[PDB]
């Protein structure tokens, strides 16, 4: 229960709750 960030080139800012 922390987070799920999948950023690469620096444009894809995927911030999903780790619930």
From Swiss-Prot:
<protein>
    <recommendedName>
        <fullName>Surface protein gp120</fullName>
    </recommendedName>
</protein>
<comment type="function">
    <text>Attaches the virus to the host lymphoid cell by binding to the primary receptor CD4. This interaction induces a structural rearrangement creating a high affinity binding site for a chemokine coreceptor like CXCR4 and/or CCR5. Acts as a ligand for CD209/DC-SIGN and CLEC4M/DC-SIGNR, which are respectively found on dendritic cells (DCs), and on endothelial cells of liver sinusoids and lymph node sinuses. These interactions allow capture of viral particles at mucosal surfaces by these cells and subsequent transmission to permissive cells.</text>
</comment>
<comment type="subunit">
    <text>The mature envelope protein (Env) consists of a homotrimer of non-covalently associated gp120-gp41 heterodimers. The resulting complex protrudes from the virus surface as a spike. There seems to be as few as 10 spikes on the average virion. Interacts with host CD4, CCR5 and CXCR4. Gp120 also interacts with the C-type lectins CD209/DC-SIGN and CLEC4M/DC-SIGNR (collectively referred to as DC-SIGN(R)). Gp120 and gp41 interact with GalCer.</text>
</comment>
């Amino acid at each position: 229960t922390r987070k799920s960030i999948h950023i690469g080139p620096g444009r894809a800012f995927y911030t999903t709750g780790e619930i």
